[PDB]
Homo-oligomer: A and B are copies of this chain.
Amino acid sequence: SCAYELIKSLPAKLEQLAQETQATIQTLMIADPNVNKDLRAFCEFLTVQHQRAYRATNSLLIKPRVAAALRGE
């Protein structure tokens, strides 16, 4: 294929993971207040993780020479 599309699709892949685990963590019946707090904090870690990636890939792919190189142009 091409490297441009691999990298550009990276943020959505991380977003998918974040939702999978958040959704699954939600199907839990946890009574412990601290465990709930830990998992909540981990869930926010995954959201932040996605946004850093989104920002990093966005800043990368606007560089015309970079996009051209990744497209085999």
Name A residues whose Cβ lies closer than 8 Å to a Cβ of B.
2-3, 6-7, 10, 13-14, 17, 20-21, 24-25, 27-28, 30, 32, 34-35, 38-39, 42, 45, 49, 52-53, 56-57, 60, 63, 65-66, 69-70, 72
Contacts and interface: CB of A to CB of B under 8 A. Distances in A.
Contact of A69 (B14, B35, B60, B66): B35
- The count of identical subunits is 2
A35 B72 contact: no
B21 A39 contact: no
A interface SS class? helix
A21 to B, nearest CB: 6
B25 A3 contact: yes
